[PDB]
Symmetry: C22
Subunit: 93 residues, 22 copies
């Protein structure tokens, strides 16, 4: 049963990575899921010379926070390829 659960989690991770790669100016990303108020970690590798709107960074936030049950939109930690802690709501300091 645990093997089935971990395989399902890995397949979800692969599908999510493929979909977020299918976003235009992104060659690849790396998503990891955390299941206990859950949370998730996104490490986007943004393509150089490209920058999407805040309304589309929230698009990435809600894209990853929606397709998984119980993930609040404010619990996704978004980090680019070199620093750039964009989620100021988590790190409110």
């Amino acid at each position: 049963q645990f093997s089935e659960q971990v395989n399902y989690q890995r397949a979800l991770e692969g599908e999510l990575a493929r979909t977020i790669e299918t976003l235009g100016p992104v060659k690849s990303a790396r998503v990891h899921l955390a299941m206990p108020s859950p949370s998730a970690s996104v490490t986007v590798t943004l393509e150089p010379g490209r920058a999407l709107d805040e309304g589309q960074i929230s698009a990435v936030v809600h894209l990853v926070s929606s397709a998984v049950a119980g993930l609040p939109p404010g619990n996704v930690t978004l980090v680019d390829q070199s620093g750039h802690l964009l989620t100021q709501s988590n790190t409110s300091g």
Copy 2:
């Protein structure tokens, strides 16, 4: 049993993706289902030089929110191929 459930979910995802592709100015899309007040994530790849009405974007919203049980019309997150967080009801800020 869990394998049957996941296969049924994947088949539903494939059928829904095919139907939403069968919408004219869309080559392909990517739907993911979230089952616990459920919710779903749609990442449409709109064809360039095409733009459908708001009454037909709500058509996509209700098309994905209807064919699955218990999905409210206000819980679908719609994102185009490059940002464009169209669903302002979820992100009411």
Copy 3:
């Protein structure tokens, strides 16, 4: 048992799609069933240069809402091949 249920649902979907295709100015459609106050989604692909009466759009609504148990006539979401959210009763805004 679940396989039998899903096969029966798929066969019903295929038969319904064939019957709604057998309506004159329609080459093909795509029906999906939602079973919990149930609801259903219809994505008709109307033939160009053809337009049926409102009393025959309600014919499609009742045709899909009747042959399945417990589906109210006001819960069918009807969308043409390009937008055109015809069901104003669901989207009363």
Copy 4:
């Protein structure tokens, strides 16, 4: 058991379709049964240049509403090959 029930329902559907085809100016029809106050859907394809009486449209209504147990005569939805929602009792608006 469920397979026996669905096969019996399909055989009833085929027999009913053959009998309603055996009505003169009809090449073929499409009946679907709904079992929970049940109801049924009839999509007649009337032959061009032919039109039967109201007392014989009620003949079709009672022909389909009688040979199945518990189907009230006012719950049959009758639609021709192109719109023409004839049953005004269901759609009393």
Copy 5:
């Protein structure tokens, strides 16, 4: 058991159809039985240029309403080959 019941019902239907065909000016008919106050549906194909008495149409009514247990004489719906809802007692309007 259900297969035995359905085979017995089909054999009764065939025998009844043969007997009602054995009535003179009738090449063939189509009877269907409904078992829950039961009821039945008769679709007679009367031979052209022939018309039997009302006391012999009631002969058909009682012929089909008698050989089956519990069928009241007023619950048989009689329809000719083209409309002609003869049973005015059911459709008392």
Copy 6:
């Protein structure tokens, strides 16, 4: 057991048909039995140019109503080869 019962009923039907055929001016008849106050249906094919007494039509009535248990003499519906509802006691109108 049900097969034995139906075979016994069919054999009784065949024997009764042979005996009623063995009545002189009758080439063949068709009897059907109804078992729940039971009743039965007789469709005699009287030979042309022949007509038996009322005291011998009651002979047919009691001949079919006697050889089967519990069948009252007033419950037999007698119909000739073309209409002629002779049993006025059932149809007292």
Copy 7:
């Protein structure tokens, strides 16, 4: 057991038919037994130009009413080869 009972009843019927045939001016008859106040049906084929006494018609009545247990002498229905309802006690009208 039921097969044994029906075979015994058929053998009794055959023996009774042979004995009543062994009565002089009778080539053959047809007896049927009814078992629930039981009753029986006799269809004698009297030889032309022959007529037995009333005290010997009652001989036939008691001959068939005696050799079977519990059959009252007044419950036998006697019919000749063409009408002739002789038993006026049953049909006292």
Copy 8:
């Protein structure tokens, strides 16, 4: 057991028929037994030109009423080869 009983009854019938045949002016007779106040039926075929005393007709009555248990002497129905209901005690009218 029932087969043994019926075979014993048939053997008794055969023996009784042989003994009553062994009575002089009788070529053959036909006895049938009725077992529930029981009763029996005798159909003697008296030889022409012969007639035995009443004290020897009562001999036949008691001969058949004695060799079987519980048969009263007044319950035997005696009929010759052509009518002649001799037992006036049963038919006291």
Copy 9:
């Protein structure tokens, strides 16, 4: 067990018939036993030109009434080869 009983009864009948044949002016007789106040039936075939005393007819009566348990001397019915109901005690009328 029943077969043993019937074989014993038949052997007793044969022995009794042989003994009563061994009585001088008797070529053969026919005895039948009745077992429930029992009774028995004797059909003697007296040799012509011979007649035994009443004290030896009572010899036959007691000969058959003694060798079987519980048979009273007044319950034996004695009949010659042609009528002649000798036992006036049974038929006291």
Copy 10:
């Protein structure tokens, strides 16, 4: 067990017959035993021109009444080869 009893009874009968034959002027006799106040039947065939004393007829009576348990000396019925009911005590009339 019943076969053993009947064989023992038959052997007793044979031995008794042989002993009573061993009495001088008797070629053969025929004894039958009756077992419920029991009784027995003796049919002696006395040799012609011979007659034994009454004190030796009582010898036969006690010879048959003694060698069997419980048989009273007054219950033996003695009959010669032609009538001659010698036992006047049984037939005291």
Copy 11:
């Protein structure tokens, strides 16, 4: 067990017959035993021209009444080869 008992009784009978034969003027005798106040039967065949004392006839009586348990000396019935009921104590009349 019953076979053992009857064989023992027969062996006792044979031995007793041999011993009573071993008495001088007796070629053979015939003893039978009766077991329920028991009793026994002796049929002596006395040699002609020989006659033993009364004190030796009582010798025979006690010889047969002693070697068997419970047989009183007054219950033995003694009969010669031709009548001669010697035991006047049993037949005290």
Copy 12:
């Protein structure tokens, strides 16, 4: 067990007969034992021209009454080869 008992009794009888034969003027005797106050029977065959004392006839009495348990000296019945009931104590009359 019963066979063992009867064989032991027969062996005792043989031994006793041999011993009583071993008494001088006796060629052979015949003893029989009776076991329920028991008793026994002795049939001595005294040699002609020999006569033993009364004190030695009592020797025979006590010789047979001693070697068997419970046999009183007054219950032995002594009979010579021709009558001669010597035991006057048993027959005290």
Copy 13:
């Protein structure tokens, strides 16, 4: 067990006979044992011309009464080869 007991008794008898034979003027004797106040029987065959003392006849009495348990010295019955009832204590008359 009974066979063992009887064999032991017979062996005791043989040994006792041998010992009493081993007494001088005795060629052979015959002892029999009686076991229920028991008793025994001795039949000595004294050699002619020899006579032992009374104190040695009591020697024989005590020799046989001692080697067996529970045999009183006054219960041994002593008889010579020809009468001579020596034990006057038993026969005290």
Copy 14:
């Protein structure tokens, strides 16, 4: 077990006989044991011309009364080869 006991008793008897033979003027003796106040029997065969003391006859008495448990010295019966009842204590008369 009983065989073991009897073999042990016989071996004791043989050993005792050998020891008493081993006494000088004795060629052989015969001892028998009696086991219920037990007792024993000794039949010594004293050698002619020899006579042992009374204190050595008591030696024999105590020799046989000691080596067996529970045998009192006054219960041994001593008899020579010809009478000579030496034990006057047992026979104190």
Copy 15:
């Protein structure tokens, strides 16, 4: 077990006999053991011309009374080869 006990007793007897033989002027002796206040029997065969002290006859007494459990020194009966009852304590008369 009993065989083991008797073999042990016999071995003890043999050993004791050998030891008492090993006493000088004794060629052989014969000891027998009695086990219920037990006792024992010694039959010494003293060598001629030899006589041991009383303090050594008591040596034999205690030698046999000691090596066996529970044997009192006053219960040993000592007898020489010819009478000589030495133990005056047992025979204190």
Copy 16:
């Protein structure tokens, strides 16, 4: 089960190490997980001549603290390739 858990932990460690390596100026790192307020240890090997922001060091902290359930952001210990205890919140001294 424990092997499955440790393999899952090792796979998580490998994936996390690969992702943190996929951060630009990092050739490799070494993560270890601690599961009981849990905690974790990170030993980054920063590439020479590179230094990321504090808002991206907190990016590493939250990247490792998010993808694992229940890890607070203040419990991650971050150490470079040579000392440099950057996390001053843990070591608040």
Copy 17:
């Protein structure tokens, strides 16, 4: 078990005999053990011309009374090869 005990006792006897033989002026002795206040018997064969002290005769007494459990020093009976009852404590008279 009893065989083991007797073998152990015999081995103890052999060892004790060997040790007491190993005493100088003794070629062999004979010890027997008595086990219920137990006791033992010693029959020493002292070598001629040798005599040990009383303090060494008590040495033999205690040597045999010590090596066996529970044997009191005053219960050993010591006898030389010819009388000489040395133990005056046992025989204190």
Copy 18:
């Protein structure tokens, strides 16, 4: 299970040793884990001519105290390759 635990502990030890070796100026170290307030022992072999900060010695302390559950930062004992007890908090003297 214990083998699995010890193998897991050894693998953790090996991984920790490899990671601490991966720290620059360290060729190898030796870690041992202690599991009951747990504690651990570190024996670092610092490379000559190298010395890291106190804030990086605390880096080693927290690196080993973090990756294992429940290890407080003050319970790690740190010793270089030659003495140098650096942890003054444990050894506070």
Copy 19:
């Protein structure tokens, strides 16, 4: 178990004998153990011309009384090769 105990006792005896032989002026001894206040027997064979101290005779006493559990030093009986009861404490008289 008993065999193991006796073998252990014999091995202890052999070892003790070897050790006491290993004492200088002793070629061999003989020890026997007595186990119920236990006791033991020692039969030393002292070498001629040798005599050890009393403090070394007590050495032998304690040497044998110590190596076995529960043996008091005052319960060892010491005897030389010819009398010499040295232990005056046991024999305190």
Copy 20:
């Protein structure tokens, strides 16, 4: 289980010995563990011409007292290759 524990203890001993050997001026040492306030024994073989600080002897003490659970730092006994009881805290005298 005990074998697993002892093997684990031996492996810990070997690893600890190797680590303490890996301390510079030590060729080999010998550690033994004591498990019940536990304790341990260290026998260091210090290399000649080398002497570490007291703060590094306490390093050895805590190195061995830390890597094993529950060992207090004051319970380790430290001894060099030749005496030199360094731990004065244990031996506080």
Copy 21:
């Protein structure tokens, strides 16, 4: 189990003997263990011309009294090769 215990005791004895032999001026010794306040026996064979201190005789005492559990130092009995009861504490007289 007992065999294991005795083998362990023997191995302990052998090891102790070897160690006490390894004491310089001792070629061999003999130790025996006594287990119930236990005790032990030592028989030292001191080498001639050698004598150890009292503080080293107590060394032997404590050497044997220590390596075995529960042996008090005052319960060891020490004896040289020829007398010399050194332990005056045990033999305090």
Copy 22:
């Protein structure tokens, strides 16, 4: 289990002997363990011309008293190769 314990004890003994041999001026020693306040025995063989400090004799005492659980430092008995009871604390006299 006991074999495992004894093997573990022997292995501990061997290891301890090897370690104490590894002490410089010692070629070999002999340690024995005593397990019930336990105790132990050490027999050191000190090398000639060598003498370690008292603080290193206490080193040996604590070296053997530490590596075994529960052994107090004052319960070790230390003896050199020739007397020299060094432990004055045990022998405080």
